[PDB]
Amino acid sequence: AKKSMIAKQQRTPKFKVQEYTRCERCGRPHSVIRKFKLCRICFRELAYKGQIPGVKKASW
Amino acid sequence: GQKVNPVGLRIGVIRDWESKWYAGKDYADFLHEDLKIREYISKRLSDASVSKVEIERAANRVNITIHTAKPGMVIGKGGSEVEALRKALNSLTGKRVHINILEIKRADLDAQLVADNIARQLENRVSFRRAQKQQIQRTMRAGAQGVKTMVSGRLGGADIARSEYYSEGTVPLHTLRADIDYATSEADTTYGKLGVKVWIYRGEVL
Amino acid sequence: KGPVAKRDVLPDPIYNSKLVSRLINKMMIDGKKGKSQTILYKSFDIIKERTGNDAMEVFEQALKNIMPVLEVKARRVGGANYQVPVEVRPERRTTLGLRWLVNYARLRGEKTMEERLANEILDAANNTGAAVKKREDTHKMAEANKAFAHY
RNA sequence: GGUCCGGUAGUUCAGUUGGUUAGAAUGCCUGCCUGUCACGCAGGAGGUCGCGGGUUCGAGUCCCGUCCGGACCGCCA
RNA sequence: GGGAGUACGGUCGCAAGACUGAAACUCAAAGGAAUUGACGGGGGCCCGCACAAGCGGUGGAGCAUGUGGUUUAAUUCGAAGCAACGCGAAGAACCUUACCAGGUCUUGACAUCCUCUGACAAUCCUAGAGAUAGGACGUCCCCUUCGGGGGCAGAGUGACAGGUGGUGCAUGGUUGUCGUCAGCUCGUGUCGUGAGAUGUUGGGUUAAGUCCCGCAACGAGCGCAACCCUUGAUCUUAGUUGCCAGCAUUCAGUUGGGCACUCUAAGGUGACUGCCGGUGACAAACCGGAGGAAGGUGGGGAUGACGUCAAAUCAUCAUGCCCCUUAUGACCUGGGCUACACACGUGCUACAAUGGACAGAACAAAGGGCAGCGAAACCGCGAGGUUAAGCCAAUCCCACAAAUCUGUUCUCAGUUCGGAUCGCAGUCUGCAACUCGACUGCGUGAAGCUGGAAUCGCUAGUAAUCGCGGAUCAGCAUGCCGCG
RNA sequence: AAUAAAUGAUGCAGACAGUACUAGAU
Structure with missing residues (x-):
């Protein structure tokens, strides 16, 4: 039940409070990201693939 | 846990950003739009053997650079191809989209197309030894200081799935300045799914 | 390896x-030096007040009294669990x-650590004291383990 | 059948004799160590005194009757 | 080969037993040598908070959280010593929600197919819990040289869709462990008729199979250091939204004014055994010595060599196979995911005099701000509410850090300790904190006075300990990430 | 006047599965 869940996410909620977040690429709730709106593994792979101009390997 | 790809590690050292722009209040929106554009262009030109596609934001204008290694198969007559490639993106995005097409010389050196050809040969029921060895020889004659290709999954067996290594030359993944081109490919066979991993060492920059 | x-x-x-600086470093809890x-x-002030003498000499005599000369170190040579007296270096x-x-x-127990430490310094200057009980027990153990003065 | 001894934690034995009070091990459980086990260590619960009466402020305990498991005689011609 | 040097028979012997010596049955191995690895309570040698010495905890108590047992309308599912148990899941009132009670639907919630009829939407009454209908107001679509095409809704057909359904003992992809340990390999040549060895063995040496010597071997790859980022000092480039000394003004660094200087963001330099003595083979290599911010990878981060655990994930995604399909799929209200006689991991608070309460005072470092962050003023003991400046940010704000210090006060008690459980009254949000947040005031206040075997982390700005900001977020952190 | 380097003996640790496991072609 993945694309059904995506369609439910896309549904117009009765109240705006009923809205929840999804990474817009897969059906993974539980720690979707706001700044990028991309799933954890998806965002990681995409950043590794040269996209996301702002994010790079961090060192401190 | 195992090694990490060099694509995400070499950024800032030598490799530039495949996406070059400064956005605001629409970062994730533009990122999703570009992801959809890349998905569509890959599914469309999957037969045209396109390696990578860069995009640049130009204040409501989008400049797309495409590396295909074969112009006559991506531009062809010039008109029909450019129309079919640009108007579709324009309609599916909502604003102007400009396309530029570069040709990769020595097409047997880029990991993306190398893995694509290996996966095609595998799907053509070619032996996992003949195809690998032939591709390695092709790359080495084209010119590369090191080539590494790995295939894992069911290579003809049902109970066990194992990996295979075949590489010649120097592939120093730990050397930061290596400009190693890395790319992955998948091959869905009748016995299951096969995964192709290829990272090619082209040379170091002083 | 080696010392540091x-x-x-x-x-x-x-x-x-x-030694007063080392004591200050000691007794400190929660990074509150x-x-x-x-x-x-305040303890040294109370000492100087009750006793008409400089607290430095009293503290020195208390240290001279409590300082243990011989230490009894355990050692398991077979199923005996023996002990070996040891000469303690001045630092230790x-x-x-x-x-x-x-x-x-x-451990004594009073209304303030100040008074506790003052009375402890007093009962140390006068050999009769709690820490001197520990000293005497250690000396008794070292004497009873004299059989192993050296391996 | 006739005399004598006991019926107590789940098990084996104390406690009864001194009337106002139930103990030791084993056993089980919890915990600790051990990769898993045993071994090992720290705790917890668990008997209502075979059964029914009587003296009592009060009976596991004193005196009775009963059912059990035992120790011996059940002979003389 | 076991049967079996056994049974019968015979000879010997006082006896113990000795000599001779089968068969049935049963298995396709039993056995010898040597090669590689593995292990050892065999030896030599080395180091990792491992041990030794300590700083503080867990294990006793309350709470929070998670896991197994037991209980449920469901308590969705995975993970199970190191390598599961503050883990997926970086925030369950509905929504997330999977699981369950009930009301429902079946080209279906979602995407391609086909025939048409034309825009759908948007306001309003009834059932509603709503799914959904009964419906009314109402549909304005466009493009062409008249066919048609570009979406949306509907009306019929079946290809289909759905699978958080199973298989991680079929897989791709992604990670944990050995392990940041130092080893794992290849071309040529030699030896051994063989598996294999030689290179990688021997000596010195290092964090390293790092390096040097010898060398029946010569070279090379994956590793290791290296160049990557951060910090520790300096020259120059630049002073506004930074700094304020020299200058003059200010209640305020607020103004004119300077870029002296912290500072920030750029190019360089620098530390690279660079130099000297000693040791060592004269080498590799080690101790000391001047400089210097930096002396022997300066500290830290990224970087995890071949392979092992049929390790974890069919739940992020795809995935062959198997299975359901008017249902193992889909819509909605409510419930459950948060129940506890229980036990156990992790964390927070407590048992008090280095203390409790009250008065005064100083210093912060990093990060965020557009339906977002929100100065200042007012109201209220209070959480917070009203008007609202400013800020798309070195400007303005979040945001007056607390520990700490100087004072007043109490006094060794289950207490002026702790605030849990608790009754009431309120605050933030949101349709609604009732199963179901946090916070505040009122009145009380136990468990608890240091906690059993045993066990855990920590060698320097580390331990311990006090605050600060962000993720997930309408509103929710003792956990996470970092900072001081 | 000089000045010697010793000394060594350690007690305990029992078991772990029945059936399981990788392939290659001039």
């Missing part, structure tokens, strides 16, 4: 002494004296 070096801060206006400094200052002697002083002072 270290250092401390000597200068202290109230009864300047490197100011509390320990104030406690030591001073550290053990400070440990016993602080521990037995806080």
